[PDB]
């Protein structure tokens, strides 16, 4: 088939392109991964030295970009004064008065080392406050190795009592929670389906998810580990929503290994946690002289303007492909069709045959199709609205049609 | 009480000495004498809030072994930084960094990074419990594997809810009879070749090749966790011992000094699907720690000085007939109030006189856990090891009429 013999031709040409990633692979022992060497800004060079525009950011952690200037100062200060300092630093308390101050709805803070842990914390605590073992989630969520749904389950989670529901559908939820409500400790639910696809949710879903969560006693957790950046406040002050807990993922902490939870006193008063000082420095750097509240604005509004632009150069060349999601963060999908839930991403080949063509013109985003805009990315757009257009042009034949 | 008296005096001392570490607390409580903020450090030596100096011999929890500025690591946390922050999931550092890990410690077949133990031991549970299917994991009472895997209390409302059982530590007879209880049912053993938080006491070695047999003939892992032990040779205590383990758990010295765990051993057992760490900073510093700073000469050393320097500190307390004790393995120890010979936690059957001794030490310049751990870093040499025995010589002498007697 056509589209079989331009995805190998695609694919065979990455392969010749790229030796030293495919070496790589082979010492570290489905085409080989690209393989990294340095970055700047918002360009990556791998190590085969071929420079890229960054439209993944890291899957929304290198917000920052890879080299900027105020964290890169912070950090080499905060080496210089001493690495492994004790369980008692004056950067924790100032970080996490930052973090309060940006959600005054986190009453009580507590740092741990990735967002995994976060949400694995935070499910503790409502276990432990209520004594309730089931714990709503969501099909196609993603809140870490041991806290994933993408499969409906995956054999490696912890062992809660997971219930599981159909994404912004609030009518099988309440059936569930009809089923569940005495024995429900917790509702986990993204403000958006980071790994399902970017799919928002409804704002009449959450509400409800919250009203629900009230009056059967489960507490509402919200991993706002990607959808933090939607605002200062993330999408909960967006939309003006109170959790009982709130997690929140790396990129508050300036790049580097970071978690953090909280939410209500009574419920958190229970509280290794992660004070490291690089961690520490860099994250409050990063809040408190980068990431303004207009800078964030900024960003979102551009990738809001730039996810129009991709679905214009689909929707001009009857293109059934699309890019979902709110902000700085989208992804590209092979079907037009309108995403409630992971039942509706219901071909891989023409998701592979767009990574490889923008690789081919320098444009680096997950193989999935996941963008997310950093600080550094007008020109970076018109240059990747410029390299689909190319693209779509030349490959029309091999899409499917709108 | 002479005693209350003088930890009363000693107390209030401590927070007439230190305002800025009690104003640092008062702001932090917008989100028990109040702890010690330190500000800086240097090698051995930490630099608090109030700027008083200190002999760091607690070594952040076994976790600054290298000391808090060494030039190698800091050089490549510095080259690492200038290539760039937030690379992709797909760089050269970490097949580096397991390629060494994996030749310290060939018996991982296959080798995971994490953030944190606490993630390596989860890690290392889940694949336990996926591979065999079982729902019990053994554990033993004063152990502790993580923030969620904790075991001091004998349990943890906060603990992952897995079916925990739980044995005493060192004591093969009554895990022989939970285990002929639940053998069918045990996907892991996981055991620290020393009690950590317990107050390090070392395992009997018996004891963890027992545990291998009954793993073995029940079916069940053997988890070893040497985040803290693992630093007793170069292939740690499994080496030492020869106990090869199902799976290993290492902790965060192997990163650097930064946010890091691994886990791994047999391919059968091992292996989105699971958020992987390969940090810029953390993948440079541990590999460049571990390949040029952390050889097998320089950690003999480190264990050779610790040895001594415990039986100079036990020392001090046999001359003075004073019933207090040092106890661990190589460069890794801790006081306990008691001189009664530990085999598990129950053996550690009054924490005034440590919170006297950890106070009067600090008024000396020598830092520990208010619990009383040590653990050596490179950085900490003969002259540290002389200087800290003085001072616990000089402190027993002085505070002699308070302490139990032999």
């Known amino acids: 088939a056509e589209k079989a013999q331009a995805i190998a031709a695609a694919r065979n040409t990455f392969a010749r392109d790229n030796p030293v990633s495919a070496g790589h692979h082979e010492r570290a022992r489905r085409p080989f991964p690209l393989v990294i060497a340095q970055g700047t800004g918002s360009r990556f060079q791998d190590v ?18 890879h080299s900027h200037p105020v964290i890169r100062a912070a950090v080499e200060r905060a080496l210089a004064v001493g690495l492994n300092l004790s369980t008692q630093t004056e950067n924790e308390a100032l970080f996490a008065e930052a973090v309060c101050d940006r959600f005054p709805s986190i009453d009580l803070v507590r740092f741990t080392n ?22 709503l989630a969501f099909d196609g969520g993603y809140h870490g190795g041991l806290l994933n749904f993408a499969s409906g389950h995956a054999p490696t989670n912890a062992p809660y009592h997971v219930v599981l529901g159909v994404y912004n559908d ?37 509400d409800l998810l919250r009203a629900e969560a009230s009056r059967c006693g489960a507490l509402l957790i919200f991993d706002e580990v990607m959808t933090s950046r939607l605002s200062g406040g993330g999408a909960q002050e967006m939309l003006g929503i109170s959790a009982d807990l709130t997690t929140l993922g790396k990129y508050i902490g300036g ?8 939410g209500r ?21 990063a ?17 809001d303007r730039f996810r129009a632009n991709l679905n214009r150069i689909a929707v001009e060349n009857q293109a059934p492909l699309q890019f979902t999601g709110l902000g700085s963060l989208g992804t590209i999908h092979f079907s037009r069709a309108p995403i409630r839930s992971a039942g509706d991403v219901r071909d891989q080949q023409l998701k592979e045959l767009f990574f490889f063509h923008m690789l081919r013109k320098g444009i680096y985003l997950a193989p999935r199709g996941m963008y997310a805009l950093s600080l550094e990315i007008d020109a970076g757009r018109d240059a990747f609205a410029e390299a689909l257009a190319d693209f779509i042009g030349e490959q029309r034949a091999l899409l499917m049609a709108a």
């Open 255 to 262: 790049g580097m290994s970071f978690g953090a939870f909280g």
């Open 170 to 206: 609030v009518e099988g939820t309440a059936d569930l929670l009809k089923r569940h409500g005495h024995d429900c400790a917790a509702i986990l639910v993204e403000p958006m389906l980071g790994a399902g696809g970017c799919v928002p949710a409804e704002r009449a879903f959450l």
């Open 287 to 303: 809040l408190t002289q980068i990431y303004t509240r207009q800078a964030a604005s900024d960003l979102s509004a551009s990738g």
């Open 48 to 65: 085969d030295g071929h420079a890229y525009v960054n439209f993944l950011g890291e899957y929304t952690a290198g917000l920052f970009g």
């Open 265 to 285: 006193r009574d419920l958190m008063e229970r509280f290794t946690f992660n004070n490291n000082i690089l961690t520490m420095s860099a994250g409050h750097a």
């Open 114 to 135: 990735s967002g995994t842990e976060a949400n694995l914390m935070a499910l503790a605590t409502a276990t432990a406050i209520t004594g309730r073992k089931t714990v």
